[PDB]
Design an enzyme around this catalytic site. Structure first.
Site, short mmCIF file in Angstrom:
data_model
loop_
_atom_site.label_atom_id
_atom_site.label_comp_id
_atom_site.label_asym_id
_atom_site.label_seq_id
_atom_site.Cartn_x
_atom_site.Cartn_y
_atom_site.Cartn_z
N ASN A 243 3.00 -12.84 -1.47
CA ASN A 243 2.74 -14.29 -1.32
C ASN A 243 1.25 -14.58 -1.14
O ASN A 243 0.80 -15.06 -0.09
CB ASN A 243 3.50 -14.85 -0.13
CG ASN A 243 5.02 -14.79 -0.28
OD1 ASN A 243 5.59 -14.68 -1.39
ND2 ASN A 243 5.69 -14.88 0.85
N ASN B 123 -10.51 -13.22 0.62
CA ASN B 123 -11.45 -14.35 0.76
C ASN B 123 -12.47 -14.27 -0.36
O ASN B 123 -12.79 -13.16 -0.83
CB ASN B 123 -12.14 -14.32 2.11
CG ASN B 123 -12.83 -15.70 2.44
OD1 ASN B 123 -14.01 -15.94 2.10
ND2 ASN B 123 -12.08 -16.61 3.08
N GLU C 252 0.81 -1.22 0.00
CA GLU C 252 0.00 0.00 0.00
C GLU C 252 0.84 1.27 0.00
O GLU C 252 0.37 2.30 -0.46
CB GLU C 252 -0.95 -0.03 1.19
CG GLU C 252 -0.31 0.02 2.55
CD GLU C 252 0.16 -1.30 3.12
OE1 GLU C 252 0.15 -2.38 2.44
OE2 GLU C 252 0.59 -1.27 4.33
N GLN D 277 -3.61 -9.78 5.74
CA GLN D 277 -3.42 -8.74 4.74
C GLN D 277 -4.74 -8.11 4.28
O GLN D 277 -4.86 -6.88 4.23
CB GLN D 277 -2.62 -9.30 3.55
CG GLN D 277 -2.11 -8.25 2.59
CD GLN D 277 -2.93 -8.17 1.28
OE1 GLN D 277 -3.99 -8.75 1.17
NE2 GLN D 277 -2.36 -7.54 0.27
N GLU D 278 -5.73 -8.91 3.94
CA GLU D 278 -6.98 -8.34 3.45
C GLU D 278 -7.67 -7.52 4.52
O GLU D 278 -8.14 -6.39 4.25
CB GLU D 278 -7.91 -9.43 2.96
CG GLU D 278 -9.27 -8.85 2.59
CD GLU D 278 -10.21 -9.77 1.84
OE1 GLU D 278 -10.52 -10.88 2.36
OE2 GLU D 278 -10.70 -9.31 0.74
N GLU D 279 -7.76 -8.04 5.74
CA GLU D 279 -8.46 -7.32 6.80
C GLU D 279 -7.76 -6.01 7.12
O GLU D 279 -8.44 -4.99 7.35
CB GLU D 279 -8.61 -8.18 8.03
CG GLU D 279 -9.60 -9.38 7.80
CD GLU D 279 -8.92 -10.68 7.31
OE1 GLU D 279 -7.68 -10.70 7.06
OE2 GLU D 279 -9.63 -11.73 7.23
N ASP E 161 -5.25 -7.47 -3.26
CA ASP E 161 -5.84 -7.87 -2.00
C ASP E 161 -5.94 -9.38 -1.99
O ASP E 161 -6.61 -9.97 -2.85
CB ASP E 161 -7.25 -7.27 -1.87
CG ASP E 161 -8.11 -7.98 -0.81
OD1 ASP E 161 -7.55 -8.66 0.07
OD2 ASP E 161 -9.40 -7.89 -0.89
N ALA F 275 -2.56 -19.17 5.96
CA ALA F 275 -3.48 -20.19 6.40
C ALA F 275 -4.00 -21.05 5.26
O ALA F 275 -4.45 -22.18 5.53
CB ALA F 275 -4.66 -19.53 7.12
N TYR G 74 1.28 -6.88 12.31
CA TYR G 74 0.58 -7.77 11.39
C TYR G 74 -0.06 -8.85 12.21
O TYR G 74 0.55 -9.32 13.16
CB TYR G 74 1.59 -8.34 10.35
CG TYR G 74 0.96 -9.04 9.16
CD1 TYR G 74 0.41 -8.33 8.13
CD2 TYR G 74 0.99 -10.43 9.05
CE1 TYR G 74 -0.20 -8.96 7.06
CE2 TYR G 74 0.42 -11.08 7.95
CZ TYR G 74 -0.18 -10.33 6.97
OH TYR G 74 -0.73 -10.96 5.85
N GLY H 50 -2.11 -16.15 -0.91
CA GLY H 50 -2.66 -17.42 -0.52
C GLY H 50 -1.68 -18.32 0.21
O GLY H 50 -1.95 -19.52 0.35
N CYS H 51 -0.57 -17.78 0.71
CA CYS H 51 0.50 -18.56 1.31
C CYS H 51 0.56 -18.50 2.82
O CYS H 51 1.62 -18.76 3.41
CB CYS H 51 1.85 -18.18 0.71
SG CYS H 51 1.96 -18.49 -0.97
C1 LIG Z 1 1.13 -6.82 3.94
N1 LIG Z 1 1.97 -7.59 4.76
C2 LIG Z 1 2.69 -6.98 5.89
O1 LIG Z 1 2.51 -5.78 6.09
C3 LIG Z 1 3.50 -7.87 6.72
N2 LIG Z 1 4.29 -7.66 7.91
C4 LIG Z 1 4.88 -8.89 8.31
N3 LIG Z 1 5.77 -9.17 9.44
C5 LIG Z 1 5.75 -10.37 10.35
C6 LIG Z 1 4.73 -11.53 9.96
N4 LIG Z 1 5.27 -12.58 9.02
C7 LIG Z 1 6.41 -12.06 8.19
C8 LIG Z 1 6.80 -13.07 7.06
O2 LIG Z 1 5.64 -13.42 6.32
C9 LIG Z 1 4.64 -14.02 7.11
C10 LIG Z 1 4.12 -13.01 8.09
N5 LIG Z 1 4.44 -9.84 7.40
C11 LIG Z 1 3.60 -9.22 6.42
N6 LIG Z 1 2.94 -9.78 5.29
C12 LIG Z 1 3.01 -11.19 4.92
C13 LIG Z 1 2.12 -9.00 4.46
O3 LIG Z 1 1.53 -9.48 3.48
#
Ligand SMILES: Cn1c(=O)c2[nH]c(NCCN3CCOCC3)nc2n(C)c1=O
Ligand SMILES: C[As](C)(=O)[O-]
Length: 501
Positions: free
Chosen positions: A408, A279, A266, A293-295, A276, A413, A334, A410-411
């Site tokens: 990533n 779901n 974003e 991410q979506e929420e 996005d 849950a 996150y 759908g990667c």
């Molecule tokens: C939009 N957005 C973020 O802002 C974001 N922040 C973090 N940090 C920590 C959480 N793990 C990091 C490695 O991946 C799995 C999740 N992960 C994120 N992911 C996957 C994402 O899509």
């Protein structure tokens, strides 16, 4: 290195890359709920028509203010209930339940009570019930003067767009907060069973430490848009495609890639087509228990949430494209670490329809029970066609298409393999003639792997079809007859070996 591949500065972005928009006009496939002849920069749009018009049928939103919402008038009851002084959270719970009596033993309000009484300081609580909530009530009860035109459902297989004002969205979302939309609540509903939840009652449930953060984010938005009406427009477009590529025979080359383990979609993908990770019920658990991410995107750009009022569950060949939503909050973390940070002043330019130059596409990945299921050709083709639908803009030259900003998909849950999903999105973007900007959020090894595979394939001039055939070979040689949960050889090593041999 923090990023690899094509410099992001070389990637196309809106508004600079866009074509001149046609005249904004209602038509068979475009609902426009404002006066286009009076649309002016920095002015609140005027609703069209001037006087409320109601449709109460299976093709349109059932508005809370309809005379058919009943026998007494439920709109009259909503007005009486909400025009009371709130001073304690039980007052607000009691008000909402006065026109939701059937759910008085089903709906839990613990998170609302805890936010008001146990999270907020005294002065913040006082501001909430003396100012914010009354203002939200007033914009909600103004609905018949604001949303004067019936809103069609974006039903399955429709190719249709709705363009409405941000102020109209604010009135509708205030109604969703007060849970006023009828026929949208029953667990065993027939009507609207294929639509997402819209009323916000599940946001008030339980004791997750995430709920205060969700409520802080939403009240940030509500405080902003009741204090000063936003002046722009938002477009919601359901897109359903029939003619999908013959992927095995696609002679198109791959397009350009920027891949990085820093930044966000974003912020660093400003003006790009922002994915996005949706779901099939768009928005997922935004106003219940989800916070990935979506929420997060639906919370920091809450105008997205109103897509749940009128967007039927997505079928495999469909997506939802939203243009013009504004960012009202900044955040950190996150999922379990998500926190509201502060109010955000959106600096995006507006286009000639007064829409913020922010384009988001909801595409839902598949949820895989077993890891190897996603290498089955039917499942790979499904994900390819889903991304393609989300990226394709039928009547647009590739020079006028922004890069795709993604990651990533759908990667989490849903069990997707990031290296496979990256390559699927790269192939879909190539077929739609878009470049790719890919965010790995801290995974530097993944950034290096995706870059290395992309440059390997492009330097060897492999087409989309060439690559897809290698995916089919990987399934046949390492997945189809694999008796273990994981394959003997990983996908990218298999590809390198197959091509180099
Ligand atoms: C939009 N957005 C973020 O802002 C974001 N922040 C973090 N940090 C920590 C959480 N793990 C990091 C490695 O991946 C799995 C999740 N992960 C994120 N992911 C996957 C994402 O899509
Ligand atoms: C608001 As109702 C009684 O249709 O769930």
């Amino acid at each position: 290195k923090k990023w690899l591949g094509t410099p992001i500065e070389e990637m196309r972005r809106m508004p600079r890359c866009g074509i001149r928009l046609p005249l904004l006009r209602p038509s068979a496939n475009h609902t426009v709920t404002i006066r286009v002849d009076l649309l002016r920069a920095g002015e609140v749009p005027k609703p069209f028509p001037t006087h409320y018009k109601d449709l109460w049928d299976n093709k349109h939103v059932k508005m809370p203010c309809s005379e058919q919402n009943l026998a007494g008038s439920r709109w009259e009851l909503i007005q009486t209930a909400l025009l009371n002084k709130f001073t304690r959270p039980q007052n607000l719970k009691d008000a909402i339940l006065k026109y939701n009596v059937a759910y008085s033993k089903k709906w839990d309000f613990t998170a609302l009570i805890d936010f008001w009484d146990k999270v907020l300081e005294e002065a913040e609580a006082q501001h909430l019930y003396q100012s914010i909530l009354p203002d939200m009530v007033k914009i909600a009860l103004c609905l018949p003067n604001i949303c004067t035109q019936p809103i069609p459902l974006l039903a399955a297989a429709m190719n249709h767009s709705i363009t409405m004002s941000q102020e109209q969205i604010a009135s509708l979302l205030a109604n969703a907060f007060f849970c006023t939309f009828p026929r949208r609540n029953a667990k065993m509903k027939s009507e609207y069973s294929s639509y997402p939840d819209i009323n916000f009652n599940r946001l008030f449930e339980g004791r997750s430490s995430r709920k205060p953060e969700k409520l802080k984010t939403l009240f940030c938005y509500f405080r902003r848009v009741t204090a000063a009406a936003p002046t722009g427009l938002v477009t919601f477009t359901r897109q359903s495609l029939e003619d999908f590529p013959e992927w095995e025979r696609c002679e198109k080359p791959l397009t350009r890639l920027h891949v990085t383990y820093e930044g966000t979609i974003e912020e660093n993908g400003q003006g790009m087509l922002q994915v996005d990770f949706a779901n099939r019920f768009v928005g997922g658990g935004v106003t219940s228990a989800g916070l990935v991410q979506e929420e997060i995107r639906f919370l920091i750009n809450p105008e997205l949430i109103i897509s749940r009022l009128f967007t039927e569950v997505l079928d495999h060949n469909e997506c939802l494209i939203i243009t013009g939503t504004e960012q009202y909050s900044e955040y950190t973390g996150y999922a379990e670490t998500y926190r509201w940070s502060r109010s955000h002043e959106d600096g995006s330019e507006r286009d000639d329809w007064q829409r913020r130059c922010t384009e988001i596409v909801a595409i839902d990945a598949l949820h895989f029970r077993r890891y190897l299921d996603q290498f089955v050709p039917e499942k790979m083709r499904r994900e390819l066609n889903k991304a393609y639908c989300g990226f394709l803009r039928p009547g647009v030259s590739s020079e006028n298409l922004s890069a795709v900003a993604t990651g990533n998909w759908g990667c989490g849950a849903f069990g997707g393999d990031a290296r496979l999903k990256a390559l699927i999105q790269i192939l879909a973007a190539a077929a739609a003639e878009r470049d790719v900007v890919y965010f790995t959020f801290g995974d530097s090894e993944l950034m290096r792997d995706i870059y290395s595979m992309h440059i390997f394939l492009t330097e060897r001039k492999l087409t989309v079809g060439d690559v897809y055939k290698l995916l089919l070979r990987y399934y046949n040689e390492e997945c189809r007859n694999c008796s273990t949960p994981g394959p003997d050889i990983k996908l990218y090593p298999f590809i390198y070996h197959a091509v180099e041999s």
